Design a binder for this molecule. Structure first.
Ligand SMILES: COc1ccccc1-n1c(CSc2ncnc3[nH]cnc23)nc2cccc(Cl)c2c1=O
Length: 822
């Protein structure tokens, strides 16, 4: 069984476990043993959960950020059902009460023994919440559908649980010996080396003398640094760049001066370098795994005596307000001087005080750490700032996690992408963040699902494959059952790749209808029917992809030839008619980030009572330039509608009326009014979202509209002004908002109000977007690489301004967009 499980993990994670063994690396070995123990202990806990707690683990509630309604309810075993009129304000318990009373009459004769499953989904309705607080009920109310629910007894829930079981003394100047290298170039070679603590240099950079490009180079020289050995902070990073000159970058490499057990490194090291794009302090501190091909630098660290970093107890032994809302040297001195008062009276200003301490002085670090150990916990917002690479110290990192422990699962989910990216800044394998993420993941299966996919989707990236593979292994140790569920998803993804490759080849030699039929024959093979059917959606575990609907599957006969894959489920009814788009060829990371930021905007708006009728469709990278996008049914591109085809319900005398005609055709009579409203609200949301994020090149073929009237965007390729992008008002959109009238200032200005409201709400959470984007710099997205990218967001949110000035500014941009509008 252990052999089987080991082979299943290897397959699932995309790395053979033997590859970890082969490294013969103590840090790896220790990570694996400790984290396996941690995760297996979490699994033990989980298997004795009460039935309500089990639901909370496996089916966490989907909640929104008087009035009558019809609900259909059945019991688990029978096809018979009852349709009830209840209120939007009624609790699930009241509904379960009517259900059980109805069963007792028909069956000839305790609500608390049950939970309500959404038919054909892994989603449950339970808890003390009015029906309209549940995302599912909320959803039905807007679309018009009747909720379909299933009474599931506690014994059935426990059955699911059960089936799913498993020093201060060293004053000499720091120095190294640069021995030799082995590289490839055209000129002379130089080695630059700097000592870093996060972004900050701990002293000046020091260089080699110029040696000819032939080699196989040899230096054999001591490089001495302007910093005493006792002063080196715990997280000291030593960074190298090898380059050529008559500037031609060649390679770089970083390492920690202390190992994972706090011991100062000695003596010789061989540094397998990473190829270059000079110094890259934020780069990984682990060597290039391609030892066959990588240029290599051998260095020597001298035997200073074995010395370890001092223990905490030994460390513990050893105009203010006007600025405190970049600073001058004298301002820095004041902050440091008043550090006790910072702690006592401005605990939320911790980050500012950290950035003024001299991390290149051990006495000063000791004094900072003493305060930190008594520092009150900070809000979540503040803790996210502390995760930035600017705060490399391990005690600071540990403090950050401690303040982040109060994250709700929903908040954690919202920030998961960024917390995963921050792993790329970690100096060691065993760290507080990994342990935090693993514990949260093991306590909430939705968190576990997305953590898995965020890690799995980067396994083709050498710099993270080891770290991410190890985390995924540990996760599997803590849920054997979820491993098998994830393997089923991976198998479907493997088949989709093979199917897409086939389509790419076939469409080059034949017509689309011919390739489409061939696609269908391929899918109808037993191996494909089996692999593609009956899985949890990678885009949403709550969504069940039962039988694949081959007849309705197709592909886009352009660009990367993405696949359109439809599903149906008898048990889910209408809500089981769902699709996924599989794309191979494009890197989906920036799309996912853009969509997640838009979904965050939607949450913040809803928290202030503004529902802009957004369409946060799923987007998930799964592999190398591979991922999935959630199908939005009953939608079309604006461009297709504007084709203004004849013999259609939307056929228009003037092209400007095509879109309104289409919306009329989908929403006859009194329904037109609501559709125009959904269009106006969503238009405002996306107009504000794309403006703030700096997303240009919006055109008719990358905007879609739903039959409800809701607009949404696709094919984000560019953001943060990498194409200062203007606010955008399209005339055809204004025309719909104005109900087809040439002048309708009443409607148009309501729309302006929505835009301004949306914008002012985002400004109030501006620091959240800035902290999240800062963390995202870890991802290495080329459009999010430097300060100039972050500065775009600062300028778009106008955070240096009063709300009055910002709104004035926004108004000028909005007014400029309206004029531009024909
Ligand atoms: C209705 O879908 C379309 C309408 C007009 C033009 C293109 C599409 N469309 C689109 C438009 S993008 C889209 N379409 C539907 N739901 C979505 N969710 C996120 N993006 C979308 N995408 C495809 C992806 C794979 C295979 C196909 Cl066959 C398509 C596809 O037809």
């Amino acid at each position: 069984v252990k052999k089987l499980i080991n082979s299943q993990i290897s397959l699932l994670i995309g790395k053979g476990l033997h590859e970890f063994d082969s490294l013969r690396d103590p840090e790896v070995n220790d990570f694996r043993t400790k984290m396996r123990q941690f995760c297996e202990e979490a699994a033990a806990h989980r298997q004795q959960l009460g039935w309500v707690e089990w639901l909370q683990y496996s089916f966490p509630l989907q909640l929104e950020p008087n009035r009558a309604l019809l609900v259909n309810v059945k019991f688990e075993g029978s096809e018979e059902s009852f349709t009830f009129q209840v209120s939007t304000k009624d609790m699930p318990l009241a509904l379960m009460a009517c259900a059980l009373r109805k069963k007792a009459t028909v069956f000839r004769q305790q609500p608390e023994e049950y939970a309500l499953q959404v038919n054909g989904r892994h989603e449950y309705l339970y808890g003390n919440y009015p029906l309209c607080h549940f995302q599912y009920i909320c959803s039905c109310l807007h679309s018009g559908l009747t909720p379909h629910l299933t009474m599931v007894h506690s014994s059935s829930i426990l059955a699911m649980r059960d089936e799913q079981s498993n020093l201060w003394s060293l004053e000499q100047p720091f120095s190294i010996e640069l021995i030799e290298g082995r590289k490839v170039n055209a000129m002379k070679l130089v080695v630059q080396a700097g000592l870093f603590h996060g972004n900050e240099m701990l002293c000046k950079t020091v260089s080699s003398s110029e040696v000819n490009v032939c080699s196989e180079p040899v230096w054999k020289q001591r490089l001495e640094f302007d910093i005493s050995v006792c002063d080196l902070p715990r997280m000291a990073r030593l960074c190298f760049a090898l380059y050529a000159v008559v500037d031609c970058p060649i390679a770089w490499a970083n390492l920690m001066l202390f190992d994972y057990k706090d011991q100062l490194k000695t003596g010789e090291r061989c540094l397998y370098m990473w190829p270059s794009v000079l110094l890259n302090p934020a780069g990984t501190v682990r060597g290039n795994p391609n030892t066959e091909s990588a240029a290599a630098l051998v260095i020597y660290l001298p035997e200073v005596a074995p010395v370890y970093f001092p223990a905490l107890e030994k460390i513990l032994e050893l105009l203010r307000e006007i600025l405190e809302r970049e600073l001058y040297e004298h301002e820095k001195d004041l902050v440091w001087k008043m550090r006790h008062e910072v702690q006592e009276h401005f605990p939320e200003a911790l980050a500012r005080l950290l950035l003024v301490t001299k991390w290149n002085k051990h006495e000063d670090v000791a004094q900072m750490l003493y305060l930190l150990c008594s520092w009150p916990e900070l809000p979540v917002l503040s803790a996210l700032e502390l995760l930035d690479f600017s705060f490399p110290d391990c005690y600071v990192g540990s403090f950050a996690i401690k303040s982040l422990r109060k994250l709700t699962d929903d908040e954690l989910f919202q920030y998961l992408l960024q917390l995963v990216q921050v792993l790329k800044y970690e100096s060691y394998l065993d760290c507080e963040l990994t342990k935090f993420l693993l514990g949260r993941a093991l306590a909430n299966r939705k968190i576990g699902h997305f953590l898995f996919w965020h890690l799995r989707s980067e396994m083709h990236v050498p710099s993270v494959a080891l770290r991410f593979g190890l985390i995924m292994e540990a996760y599997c140790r803590g849920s054997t059952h979820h491993m098998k569920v994830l393997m089923k998803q991976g198998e479907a993804l493997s088949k989709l790749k093979a199917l897409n490759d086939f389509v790419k080849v076939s469409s080059q030699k034949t017509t689309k209808p011919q390739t489409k039929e061939m696609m269908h024959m391929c899918m109808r093979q037993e191996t494909y029917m089996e692999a593609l059917s009956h899985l949890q959606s990678p885009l949403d575990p709550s969504t069940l992809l039962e039988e694949v609907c081959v007849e309705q599957c197709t592909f886009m006969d352009s660009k990367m030839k993405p696949l359109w894959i439809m599903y149906s489920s008898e048990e889910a009814g209408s809500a089981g008619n769902v699709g996924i788009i599989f794309k191979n060829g494009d890197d989906l990371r920036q799309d996912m980030l853009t969509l997640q930021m838009i979904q965050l905007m939607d949450v913040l708006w809803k928290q202030e009572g503004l529902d802009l009728r957004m369409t946060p469709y799923g987007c998930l990278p799964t592999g190398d330039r591979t991922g999935l996008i959630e199908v939005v049914l009953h939608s079309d591109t604006i461009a297709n509608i504007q084709l203004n085809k004849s013999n259609m319900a939307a056929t228009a005398a003037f092209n400007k009326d095509a879109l309104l005609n289409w919306l009329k055709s989908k929403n006859p009579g009194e329904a037109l009014d609501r559709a125009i409203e959904e269009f106006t609200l969503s238009c405002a949301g996306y107009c504000v979202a794309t403006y703030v994020l700096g997303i240009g090149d919006r055109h008719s073929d990358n905007i879609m509209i739903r039959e409800s009237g809701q607009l949404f965007h696709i094919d984000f390729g560019h953001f943060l002004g990498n194409f200062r992008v203007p606010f955008i008002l399209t005339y055809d959109f204004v025309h719909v908002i104005q109900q087809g009238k040439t002048n309708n200032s009443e409607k148009f200005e309501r729309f302006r109000g929505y835009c301004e409201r949306a914008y002012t709400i985002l400004r109030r959470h501006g620091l959240l977007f800035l902290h999240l984007f800062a963390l995202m710099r870890a991802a290495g997205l080329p459009e999010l690489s430097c300060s100039k990218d972050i500065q775009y967001l600062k300028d778009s949110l106008a955070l240096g301004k009063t709300e009055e000035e910002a709104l004035k500014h926004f108004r000028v941009k909005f007014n400029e967009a309206l004029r531009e509008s024909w």
